[PDB]
Amino acid sequence: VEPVVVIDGKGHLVGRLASVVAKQLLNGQKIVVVRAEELNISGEFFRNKLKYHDFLRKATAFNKTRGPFHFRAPSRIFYKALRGMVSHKTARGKAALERLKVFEGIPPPYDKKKRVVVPQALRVLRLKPGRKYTTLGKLSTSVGWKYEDVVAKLEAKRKVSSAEYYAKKRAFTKKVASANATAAESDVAKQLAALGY
């Protein structure tokens, strides 16, 4: 219900994460997807490996440039599973997509804001315990995208830059928590209970 919805990508299914996004982009709800390389796919690591190559070789014969492209990056392999859902030929599906922006890891502006999840996506609430899964990073790093470890570095960086944060944020609430209870018992506190709050 907010101007720019920031979806965190960890713990999601490439299929069922995009399916809700494709509709949330036709309602005029802006989205920026972040931390893609931890996104997941049903089935084992080897299936997706050959879910892919058989699409990797589909390039048009008489010239390779103008054939169907193949994007190795962790983003686009999601962004390809998305742009198919939206129908983009008529101008609606074109200007509709620029509501959407995809990223790997996190970009500079959009880490500072609260990062959400979609209840019906997560690998934890769908797949059966004991079933396998595939980390899209593990996939795209193997099928010829490059930079994963360099992205894994920045993640292993900002986690620390956000670590000192949470302490200063929590320790602040530690004051306010009992300070929420230091004003209790008062004649106004008895009424808020009768008033429900």
Binding site: V5, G11, V20, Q24, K114, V116, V117, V118, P119, Q120, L122, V124, L125, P129
Partner: protein, 172 residues
């Protein structure tokens, strides 16, 4: 087939003026309404006695309710079912509350594992087993044991909104 009702039906044939009072008959039909009972009834006469709806009549149609919805009961069920490769006997046991819902639990089964439609599945009989320890299969024997305790692993709760900010867990 639907939420069921266990019907009894009594056919008397049609008396000829030479023959008053035929011996009647009655069968316990599992059907989803008044009519489907009557028809599914006549189906069992034609394959037993030569008589059929043309020469027949129905005395009464009376729903039956379980006299004890209270107690959990163990139902042995003999099932003759036609299928692709031939016809076969079965004996499957059901742990279910009442006779009329005990059969509904069965079509969900027999139309899953053995791929038989409602058209192809007769019900030969339904009977409760008095004492335990007379039970056949393990999977009915499974729950007869003393004071069962189990957790439900890996909870899920149906969600309404398309966004939930808290990273919902399975704790339970």
């Amino acid at each position: 087939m639907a939420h069921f009702k266990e019907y009894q039906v009594i056919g008397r044939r049609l008396p000829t003026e030479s023959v008053p009072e035929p011996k009647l008959f009655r069968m316990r039909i599992f059907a989803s309404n008044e009519v489907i009972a009557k028809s599914r009834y006549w189906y069992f006469l034609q394959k037993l006695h030569k008589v059929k709806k043309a020469s027949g009549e129905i005395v009464s149609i009376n729903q039956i309710n379980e006299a004890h919805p209270t107690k959990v009961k163990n139902f042995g069920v003999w099932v003759r079912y036609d299928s692709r490769s031939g016809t076969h006997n079965m004996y499957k046991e059901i742990r279910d509350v009442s006779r009329v819902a005990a059969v509904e639990t069965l079509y969900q089964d027999m139309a899953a594992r053995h791929r038989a439609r409602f058209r192809s599945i007769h019900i030969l009989k339904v009977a409760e087993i008095e004492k335990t320890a007379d039970v056949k299969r393990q999977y009915v024997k499974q729950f007869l044991t003393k004071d069962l305790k189990f957790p439900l692993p890996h909870r899920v709760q149906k969600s309404t909104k398309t966004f939930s900010y808290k990273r919902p867990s399975t704790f339970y």
